[PDB]
């Protein structure tokens, strides 16, 4: 009973991103007064399947100047990294009870960017190399704030174990004690996953592509499903870390229902901001983090090292 | 480079070397080397000439390789001993790995083809700081670990340094290049006596520091970098080059100038250890060092060289820079032989 457990995670995950593409357009359309897909099946409940099946039957082709090996492995890197990252998430009981679950997700999420430029570099295209070089410095600069924000919040945890967030915010939501860090955490998640106040990684307006430059039916599907899966989690990680929920040890279903609802609400907000703001220019999104987010990031860090000491509220290590 | 950053950059170098000479933990010694390397690379390329970039580069790969080998030799010593203290190395391979690991920092054996052109490319100011200060740290480590040193390897390290340093200097015109080979020659002299009496290499270090200092800031005052450019200084500054004779003679060890004190005192110590053939050898091959010293002496003011008519208004102007301890450094670099027994202060 572990292969069943793993396949009880992989299939629901890929189906979650599957219909997230439907709740994207059907939400995007309604926010821009459109109606979204409602033709393929009732209320569009079959449109992504029609999209997916086409994207595994229309002619794929490697670029003539491609690097075959790196061109093929990049979708492998994107998809496997996205799936493997959901592993330590503590939905009532986590699938894999890592002692350092937080550090694990930081490490692999820092790896999901090797896919974007290995794809860009191997594609041997001018828009590919531009988009690849845009994205790398975009993510790592946004990664410095990602690491410190996680540390400052988790100083009240006493450990990096994801299961302990359930116990930590048992009575009080964590956001009520770290809301200033919550704002930059949400923005950074918008930036690591490349949603659209900082979707410059794709850069469709100015770079036409960059998530998947010449990538076709299969590899394009991966680089999409590898980033829409990150959309659902980076809000599941936000939900688990900031907005805790009651967890009865005898009936975990209530926690799973509550946990799913918070991810759904957060994911809608990811789609909500996506159609309410313009595109950050490159220097602006770098200036926002290196010149406005980081100074507040370090300052609130020093606050959260001192805060438990001044209030004698050092959390238990175990 | 702004003046304030330059000072803190220097202080980091002195702190890095100081960390090496006070720490008892191997990791801290490695850290002191790492800080020394890190704060020095910007110093070399202070003026940003094209030459300095690869001059600083050749510094970096050589010393980083030396630092990494030093770290590895430390690790094996920890593996076989479980100790970080600088007492001795309990694995012969660990020691036989550090000698070259420290040697490339010192630049003694064929781990020396970095010293000449790193001196050449960089300015004269950092050249002085490179050839004098950067040797206290690696030598200090060698002095502490002097107990468990393979004498066969360490002696060969120095013997190779004296031969190459003397031989290489005979075919150099750029004053910085001849200084580097001459410094390499003195490298072997200090390191040859290392296994026997560590007090002696400290004495030779102190004398060599004064020699290299006094020689260099004389070159700074002369504002010369090649033999021909130095030649004209007789027309403008006769006393500087006349003083340069005595320092050149002292640097060659020609007594009763102070430069003999190391060469003399060292030879006395090793003959106490029944080493006779080798002491005779560096006595012989110190002469090729003396050769290009005299050629420098011949070309500077022992024979006045053709001048340049653009020197009139040069004589109309005096130096504004203010080298200090230069009058002092010449005194220690020329006449301290009557105070030879003062080496016991180091002991």
């Amino acid at each position: 009973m572990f292969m069943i457990n793993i396949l009880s995670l992989i299939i629901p995950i890929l189906l979650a991103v599957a219909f997230l593409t439907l709740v994207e357009r059907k939400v995007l359309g309604y926010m821009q007064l459109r109606k979204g897909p409602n033709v393929v099946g009732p209320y569009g409940l079959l449109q992504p399947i029609a999209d997916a099946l086409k994207l595994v039957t229309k002619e794929p082709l490697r670029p003539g100047t491609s690097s075959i090996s790196m061109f093929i492995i990049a979708p492998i890197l994107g998809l496997s990294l996205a799936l493997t990252m959901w592993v330590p998430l503590p939905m009532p009981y986590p699938l894999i009870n890592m002692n350092l679950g937080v550090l694990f997700m930081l490490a692999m999420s820092s790896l999901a960017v090797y896919s974007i430029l290995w794809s860009g570099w191997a594609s041997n295209s001018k828009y590919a190399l531009i988009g690849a070089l845009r994205a790398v410095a975009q993510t790592i600069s946004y990664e410095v704030t990602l690491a410190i924000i996680l540390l400052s919040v988790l100083l009240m945890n006493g450990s990096y174990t994801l299961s302990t967030l359930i116990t930590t915010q048992e009575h009080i939501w964590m956001i009520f004690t770290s809301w200033p860090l919550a704002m930059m955490w949400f923005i950074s998640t918008l930036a690591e996953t490349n949603r659209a106040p900082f979707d410059l990684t794709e850069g469709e307006s100015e770079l036409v592509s960059g998530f998947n430059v010449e990538y076709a039916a299969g590899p394009f599907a991966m680089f999409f499903m590898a980033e829409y899966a990150n959309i659902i989690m980076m809000n599941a990680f936000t939900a688990i870390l900031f907005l805790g929920a009651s967890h009865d040890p005898h009936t975990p279903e209530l926690y799973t229902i509550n946990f799913v609802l918070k991810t759904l609400a957060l994911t809608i907000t990811f789609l909500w901001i996506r159609a309410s703001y313009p595109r950050f220019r490159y220097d602006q999104l770098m200036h926002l983090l290196w010149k406005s987010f980081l100074p507040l990031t370090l300052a609130l860090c020093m606050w959260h090292i001192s805060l438990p000491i001044m209030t004698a509220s050092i959390p238990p290590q175990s | 480079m702004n003046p304030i950053i330059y000072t803190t950059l220097i202080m980091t170098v002195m702190s890095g070397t100081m960390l090496v000479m006070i720490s008892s933990h191997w990791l801290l010694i490695w850290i002191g080397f790492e800080m020394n390397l890190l704060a020095m690379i910007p110093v070399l390329m202070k003026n940003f000439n094209p030459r300095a970039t690869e001059a600083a580069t050749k510094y970096f790969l050589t010393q980083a390789t030396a630092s990494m080998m030093l770290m590895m030799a430390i690790i094996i010593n920890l593996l076989y001993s479980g100790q970080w203290t600088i007492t001795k190395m309990f694995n012969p391979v660990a020691m036989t790995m550090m000698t070259m690991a420290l040697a490339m920092k010192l630049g003694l054996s064929p781990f020396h083809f970095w010293v000449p052109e790193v001196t050449q490319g960089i300015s004269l100011q950092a050249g002085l700081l490179l050839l004098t200060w950067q040797k206290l740290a690696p030598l200090s480590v060698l002095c502490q670990i002097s107990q468990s040193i393979n004498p066969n390897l360490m002696l060969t390290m120095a013997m190779l340094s004296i031969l190459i340093g003397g031989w290489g200097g005979l075919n150099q015109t750029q004053l910085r290049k001849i200084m580097a080979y001459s410094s390499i020659a003195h490298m072997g002299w200090m390191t040859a006596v290392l296994p026997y009496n560590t007090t002696m290499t400290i004495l030779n270090l102190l004398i060599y520091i004064t020699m290299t200092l006094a020689m260099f800031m004389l070159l700074i005052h002369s504002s010369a970098t090649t033999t021909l450019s130095l030649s004209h200084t007789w027309n403008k500054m006769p006393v500087i080059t006349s003083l340069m004779m005595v320092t050149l003679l002292s640097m060659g060890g020609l007594p009763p100038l102070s430069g003999f004190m190391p060469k003399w005192m060292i030879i006395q110590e090793m003959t106490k250890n029944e080493s006779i053939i080798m002491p005779t050898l560096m006595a012989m091959t110190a002469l090729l060092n003396l050769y290009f010293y005299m050629r420098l002496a011949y070309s500077s003011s022992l024979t006045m060289f053709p001048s340049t008519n653009n020197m009139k208004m040069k004589w109309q102007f005096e130096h504004t820079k203010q080298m200090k301890l230069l009058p002092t450094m010449i005194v220690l670099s020329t006449l301290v032989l009557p105070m030879t027994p003062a080496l016991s202060s180091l002991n």
């Binding site: 790196m70 490490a107 820092s110 | 800080m35 690379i41 390329m45």
Partner: protein, 175 residues
């Protein structure tokens, strides 16, 4: 088969180590380092060093990212090399694979290798020690004491890294 993953993981570490040490194109060198770096994190994790394992994972990944981020910036070749490409890199590569595969063969067939030091093949599971750790992981408390027992190391490390930002700008500024 699950006898002891230490050798298998360290073997991929060496084969990945062979790769970028053969001087490929710099971008392909990053891949060769990353596989070794990732599996190296696996080796330390298997030995109980959970924090240090993921520690080298996160830092290096960011470290090598800016490495080959730089190579495509100003160190790229107009016709990049590959694992096969030139015979020199081909020769340097295949030399590494045949070398390591010779030592492991020399390692696993007598179990009394005496190159430089002594190396006897009996299983890295053996050197483990019997004993509990209470309610704390030993490695985590060891690196936690840096702020209590290692105040001297914090000062020298902090000052050096601060100087590290000074040199980087000062070197790269120019003119």
């Amino acid at each position: 088969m699950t006898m002891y993953i230490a050798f298998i993981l360290s073997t991929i570490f060496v084969i990945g180590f062979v790769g970028f040490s053969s001087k490929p194109s710099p971008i392909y060198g990053g891949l060769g380092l990353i596989v070794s770096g990732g599996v190296g994190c696996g080796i330390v994790l298997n030995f109980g060093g959970s924090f240090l394992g993921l520690m080298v994972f996160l830092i290096y990944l960011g470290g090598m990212l800016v490495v080959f981020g730089y190579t495509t910036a100003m160190a790229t070749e107009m016709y990049p090399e590959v694992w096969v490409s030139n015979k020199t890199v081909f020769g340097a590569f295949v030399s590494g694979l045949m070398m390591e595969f010779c030592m492991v063969y020399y390692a696993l067939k007598e179990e009394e290798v005496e190159i430089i030091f002594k190396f006897n093949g009996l299983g890295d599971w053996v050197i483990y020690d019997t004993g509990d750790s209470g309610f704390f992981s030993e490695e985590a408390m060891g690196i936690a004491a840096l702020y209590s027992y290692g105040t001297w190391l914090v000062i020298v490390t902090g000052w050096s890294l601060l100087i590290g930002v000074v040199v980087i700008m000062e070197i790269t500024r120019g003119n």
